Structure formats: C-alpha cells, structure tokens
Write a protein that binds this ligand. Sequence first.
Ligand SMILES: CC[C@H](C(=O)N1CCCC[C@H]1C(=O)O[C@H](CCc1ccc(OC)c(OC)c1)c1cccc(OCC(=O)O)c1)c1cc(OC)c(OC)c(OC)c1
Length: 267
Amino acid sequence: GLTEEQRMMIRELMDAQMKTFDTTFSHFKNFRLPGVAAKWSQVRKDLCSLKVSLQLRGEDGSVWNYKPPAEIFSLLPHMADMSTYMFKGIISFAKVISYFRDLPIEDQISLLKGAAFELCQLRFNTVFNAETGTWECGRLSYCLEDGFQQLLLEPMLKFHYMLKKLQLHEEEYVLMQAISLFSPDRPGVLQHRVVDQLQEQFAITLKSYIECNRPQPAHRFLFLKIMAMLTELRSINAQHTQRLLRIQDIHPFATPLMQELFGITGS
Ligand SMILES: CC[C@H](C(=O)N1CCCC[C@H]1C(=O)O[C@H](CCc1ccc(OC)c(OC)c1)c1cccc(OCC(=O)O)c1)c1cc(OC)c(OC)c(OC)c1
C-alpha cells in the first residue's frame, strides 16, 4: 500500500507539474525560425543533427512546413528558443516543490544546472508519438524524416523510443523528474546528505507506486527499467552538453538562460 506521506509526495509533484507544464505550448510565441584529421572529425560529427521536418499550424487552418537540407546553424536559433521555453517551465517546476525550496540557493542552482537537460527530455517524451515519430507541441510538430533502426542508433532518439514504449503514467514521469532533479552526485552541491535522502524517498515512492498499481507481468522490473533509463539519461546529458559547448565555441547560439545553465559567464 501507499503511505499517506507517499501520497502527499506524488500529489505535490503532480500539482507542481500541472502548474508549470504547458502541455499545449500555448505560451510559446515570438520564437525564431530557420531562414526563408581529428577535431575536424568532431566538428563534422557535432554538426550532424537528425533530419526533422517542422510544421506550424496556424489558427486559421493554414500550415507552414519546413524540410531541412536533404547546415544545422539555421536550426540552432529555433531549437535554443524552445530550449529556453522548456527550461523556464522546468525551473518553475523545481521552485514550487517544498523539498527544493528548502535547499540552499547554491544547491538549487547546482541541481538545476545538472538536471535541466534530463528534465527537458523527460517532459518532451510525454508529447512524443512513437508510431508517427513526431513531437506534437501544440500548433508545432517535429516529425522525423526518412530507416527506424538507423535513427534509433542515436542514443537520445533511442532513449525517447524506449521510454515511450514503457507507457508510463503521469505520476511515474513526475517521479523520474524528482529523482533526476534531486541527484546528490551533481557537481557543486553542498547538502549531498539531504539531497541523497530525498532521492531515496522519491525512488521508494516510485517503486511502491508501481507495485500498488501495475500488477501485470508486462510491468515486471519496471522500476529497475526506469532507474536504468535515468542512468542512461545522465550519460546522454553529459555527452550532449559537451557537443553543445563545442558548437557554442564555434557558432554562438546559446540564449542568456542557456548560458546560465551551462556556466557561461560572458567573459
Ligand atoms: C536541451 C538541449 C536541446 C534539446 O535536447 N532539446 C530542446 C529542444 C526540443 C527538445 C530537445 C530536442 O532536441 O529534441 C529533439 C526532438 C524535437 C525537435 C526536433 C527538431 C527541432 O528543430 C529542428 C526541434 O526544435 C525545437 C525539436 C531531439 C530528440 C532526440 C535527439 C535529438 O538530437 C540527436 C542528435 O542529433 O544528436 C533531438 C538541444 C538544443 C540544441 O541546439 C540548440 C541541439 O543542437 C542540435 C540539440 O541537439 C541534440 C539539443
């Protein structure tokens, strides 16, 4: 059974998610759009990107469709604007949680800087359509262009397909957000003992939630599947943070908020 303290934990996380996650993306406006030996090998590899088409449905029924060159610099401003919009909701999600507010302001910044990418992938997975390969963001749509096995070779795209195949509830998604946010091993945290105890309570609640609501054999080892996926997300987070910071050093693109979460000072 679920204890009252565990039911209160989920209720505060779900209430935090409802107040800070605009699932319809109705407040995402005024965003930019694409215009109308070694190291060379890394620069070429970092500037690869997936072939994703963009759709913008107008309120009057009109549709704008963008198809990328069948380089990625034309797509960086728009992706940075969506990143900032997602980051604003994530930061708001953390500051409405009582457990996060009670931490020192330096540990709040350290936790947010280490989990902003992971919480963005977790929220974006809830709007991902695995059958059509499309991220439906309100009037915006991001469709993967043509196969699937070769596209599932990229770890982040493979993470999105695997996490969607688990068919998780909204409460399980918001508990992965809490486990990722309250990571005691993030660089710069000072209250590692408090954050570690909080993460363990979030993980126990997720484990108890799965056992009390998913008795089917298809959900066997589901908690361990989720924990292993959250570990892979931290590795994707560390790998793609390095890729973006190498792109920023060549072609600056990061917004002010993205610079703060990356540690960029402006020199
Ligand atoms: C928090 C950092 C951010 C990111 O992760 N965000 C934020 C934007 C949407 C969600 C997610 C993402 O990217 O979701 C996309 C799917 C949704 C999407 C698709 C195309 C878009 O536009 C054409 C777009 O526009 C909003 C949004 C995704 C999913 C899986 C693998 C992906 O890349 C794998 C790879 O190429 O290595 C990408 C990011 C910014 C980048 O530059 C500013 C970037 O440089 C390219 C990048 O590379 C990975 C990531």
